Amino acid sequence: RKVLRDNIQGITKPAIRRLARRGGVKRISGLIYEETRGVLKVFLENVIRDAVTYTEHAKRKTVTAMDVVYALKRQGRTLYGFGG
């Protein structure tokens, strides 16, 4: 029954650097991190808000992987490896 605050700061800079390298970037500016965090939050909000809606309809109280994989498929991107 605790409360959570300011966890978005947990995406450390080296993690973003490592993510960028896999994409083929060579040299990175100083202002990218703040933009990236906002983009990530915006992306997550939409998926969570549909997974929750799917769950509540069946009157369950626990979210399950099937709901998440269902939610993604509606937004035009499919995921292989968790169910069908």
């Binding site: 499919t78 292989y80 490896g81 968790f82 169910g83 069908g84």
Partner: protein
Amino acid sequence: RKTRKESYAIYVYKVLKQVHPDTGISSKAMSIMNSFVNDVFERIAGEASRLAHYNKRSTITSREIQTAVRLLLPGELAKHAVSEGTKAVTKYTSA
């Protein structure tokens, strides 16, 4: 406990052993294949349903399936799939 769940596990293994005699597969790849088969099946059936509906037909016949394949698969893959389907259906009737 022990309530059965169905999947395409055995047939993928049979095909694999038919192609590469000595190779094996880990569980993760098995899950990916199991999902891929369902996805393709659903796509084809969904397309065939509306394709039949547009013409006031009631049944779903082999012709609808043959037409549906030519719309989904791109270019080269279309030819061989149609050939295999026709061969299988032709062999089935005379048995």
